[PDB]
Design an enzyme around this catalytic site. Structure first.
Site, PDB file in Angstrom:
ATOM      1  N   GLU A  35       0.814  -1.211   0.000  1.00  0.00           N
ATOM      2  CA  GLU A  35       0.000   0.000   0.000  1.00  0.00           C
ATOM      3  C   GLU A  35       0.855   1.271   0.000  1.00  0.00           C
ATOM      4  O   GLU A  35       0.563   2.206  -0.727  1.00  0.00           O
ATOM      5  CB  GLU A  35      -0.889   0.018   1.217  1.00  0.00           C
ATOM      6  CG  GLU A  35      -2.008  -0.971   1.126  1.00  0.00           C
ATOM      7  CD  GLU A  35      -3.076  -0.661   0.129  1.00  0.00           C
ATOM      8  OE1 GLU A  35      -3.019   0.361  -0.565  1.00  0.00           O
ATOM      9  OE2 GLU A  35      -3.920  -1.615  -0.076  1.00  0.00           O
ATOM     10  N   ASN A  46      -7.772   8.916  -5.473  1.00  0.00           N
ATOM     11  CA  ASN A  46      -8.537   7.907  -6.212  1.00  0.00           C
ATOM     12  C   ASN A  46      -9.434   8.543  -7.261  1.00  0.00           C
ATOM     13  O   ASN A  46      -9.710   9.770  -7.261  1.00  0.00           O
ATOM     14  CB  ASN A  46      -9.372   7.034  -5.284  1.00  0.00           C
ATOM     15  CG  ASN A  46      -8.583   6.390  -4.116  1.00  0.00           C
ATOM     16  OD1 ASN A  46      -8.937   6.546  -2.969  1.00  0.00           O
ATOM     17  ND2 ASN A  46      -7.497   5.724  -4.410  1.00  0.00           N
ATOM     18  N   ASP A  48     -12.541   8.337  -7.773  1.00  0.00           N
ATOM     19  CA  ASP A  48     -13.817   8.791  -7.194  1.00  0.00           C
ATOM     20  C   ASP A  48     -13.655  10.112  -6.411  1.00  0.00           C
ATOM     21  O   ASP A  48     -14.633  10.636  -5.866  1.00  0.00           O
ATOM     22  CB  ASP A  48     -14.518   7.687  -6.327  1.00  0.00           C
ATOM     23  CG  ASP A  48     -13.836   7.420  -4.984  1.00  0.00           C
ATOM     24  OD1 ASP A  48     -12.798   8.042  -4.703  1.00  0.00           O
ATOM     25  OD2 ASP A  48     -14.301   6.577  -4.215  1.00  0.00           O
ATOM     26  N   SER A  50     -11.901  10.480  -3.633  1.00  0.00           N
ATOM     27  CA  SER A  50     -11.448  10.185  -2.344  1.00  0.00           C
ATOM     28  C   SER A  50      -9.884  10.112  -2.375  1.00  0.00           C
ATOM     29  O   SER A  50      -9.306  10.164  -3.451  1.00  0.00           O
ATOM     30  CB  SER A  50     -12.100   8.916  -1.772  1.00  0.00           C
ATOM     31  OG  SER A  50     -11.540   7.824  -2.529  1.00  0.00           O
ATOM     32  N   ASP A  52      -6.467   8.180  -0.304  1.00  0.00           N
ATOM     33  CA  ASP A  52      -5.902   7.152   0.593  1.00  0.00           C
ATOM     34  C   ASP A  52      -4.774   7.702   1.429  1.00  0.00           C
ATOM     35  O   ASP A  52      -3.911   8.424   0.832  1.00  0.00           O
ATOM     36  CB  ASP A  52      -5.386   6.003  -0.221  1.00  0.00           C
ATOM     37  CG  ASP A  52      -6.454   5.292  -1.001  1.00  0.00           C
ATOM     38  OD1 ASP A  52      -7.582   5.173  -0.530  1.00  0.00           O
ATOM     39  OD2 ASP A  52      -6.121   4.865  -2.128  1.00  0.00           O
ATOM     40  N   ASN A  59      -8.935   5.085   3.232  1.00  0.00           N
ATOM     41  CA  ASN A  59      -9.571   6.005   2.321  1.00  0.00           C
ATOM     42  C   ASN A  59     -10.585   6.935   2.975  1.00  0.00           C
ATOM     43  O   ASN A  59     -11.294   6.569   3.939  1.00  0.00           O
ATOM     44  CB  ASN A  59     -10.248   5.083   1.282  1.00  0.00           C
ATOM     45  CG  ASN A  59     -10.889   5.776   0.166  1.00  0.00           C
ATOM     46  OD1 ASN A  59     -12.081   6.103   0.221  1.00  0.00           O
ATOM     47  ND2 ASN A  59     -10.135   5.976  -0.921  1.00  0.00           N
ATOM     48  N   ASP A 101     -15.069  -5.162   9.315  1.00  0.00           N
ATOM     49  CA  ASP A 101     -16.252  -4.676   8.613  1.00  0.00           C
ATOM     50  C   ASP A 101     -16.991  -5.688   7.795  1.00  0.00           C
ATOM     51  O   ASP A 101     -18.102  -5.402   7.335  1.00  0.00           O
ATOM     52  CB  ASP A 101     -15.951  -3.455   7.724  1.00  0.00           C
ATOM     53  CG  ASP A 101     -17.144  -2.541   7.508  1.00  0.00           C
ATOM     54  OD1 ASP A 101     -17.869  -2.254   8.505  1.00  0.00           O
ATOM     55  OD2 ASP A 101     -17.316  -2.122   6.330  1.00  0.00           O
TER      56      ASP A 101
HETATM   57 RU   LIG Z   1      -6.819   2.064  -1.597  1.00  0.00          RU
HETATM   58 RU   LIG Z   2     -19.703  -1.044   7.565  1.00  0.00          RU
HETATM   59 RU   LIG Z   3     -18.817  -0.859   5.388  1.00  0.00          RU
END
Ligand SMILES: [Ru+3]
Ligand SMILES: [Ru+3]
Ligand SMILES: [Ru+3]
Ligand SMILES: [Cl-]
Ligand SMILES: [Cl-]
Ligand SMILES: [Cl-]
Ligand SMILES: [Cl-]
Ligand SMILES: [Cl-]
Ligand SMILES: [Cl-]
Ligand SMILES: [Cl-]
Ligand SMILES: [Cl-]
Ligand code: NA
Ligand SMILES: [Ru+3]
Ligand SMILES: [Ru+3]
Ligand SMILES: [Ru+3]
Ligand SMILES: [Ru+3]
Ligand SMILES: [Ru+3]
Length: 129
Positions: A35, A46, A48, A50, A52, A59, A101
């Protein structure tokens, strides 16, 4: 800060990652390698909109606030700039939430593509742990 391999393995273990959600320490070291190349100041925008941030490239669409990601959330409850610190506490804490998550470490695409199923114990080989 640019960590050494073993230095980050050690730090990550200190901060609670050694087998967190069942992912061995080498999985975490591997993911940070691809990463961020172990650079806490790494940032990457990114498609979109966003961005990182940090060692684990967390992100702004979901996890931190940077004030410039429309419609985003801040589920780790932290400014994204926290993720760039020499001190990995905020990155590690937020990473624990991300890996919890639902999709485990597949949340990090570089981990899925470059670490998953490989001999990740290589990443901690030789290190005093
Ligand atoms: Ru990423
Ligand atoms: Ru979630
Ligand atoms: Ru989620
Ligand atoms: Cl510490
Ligand atoms: Cl482990
Ligand atoms: Cl390992
Ligand atoms: Cl925002
Ligand atoms: Cl903030
Ligand atoms: Cl630290
Ligand atoms: Cl899992
Ligand atoms: Cl090995
Ligand atoms: Na955000
Ligand atoms: Ru271990
Ligand atoms: Ru251990
Ligand atoms: Ru091996
Ligand atoms: Ru130790
Ligand atoms: Ru030990």
């Amino acid at each position: 800060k640019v960590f050494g391999r073993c230095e980050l393995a050690a730090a990550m273990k200190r901060h609670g990652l050694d087998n967190y959600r069942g992912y061995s320490l080498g999985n975490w070291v591997c993911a940070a390698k691809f990463e961020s190349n172990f650079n806490t100041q790494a940032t990457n925008r990114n498609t979109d909109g966003s961005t990182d941030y940090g060692i684990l490239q967390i992100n702004s669409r979901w996890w931190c606030n940077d004030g410039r990601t429309p419609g985003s959330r801040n589920l780790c409850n932290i400014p994204c700039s926290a993720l760039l610190s020499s001190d990995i506490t905020a990155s590690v804490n937020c990473a624990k939430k991300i890996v919890s998550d639902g999709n485990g470490m597949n949340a990090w695409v570089a981990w899925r593509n470059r670490c998953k199923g490989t001999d990740v114990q290589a990443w901690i080989r030789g290190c005093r742990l």
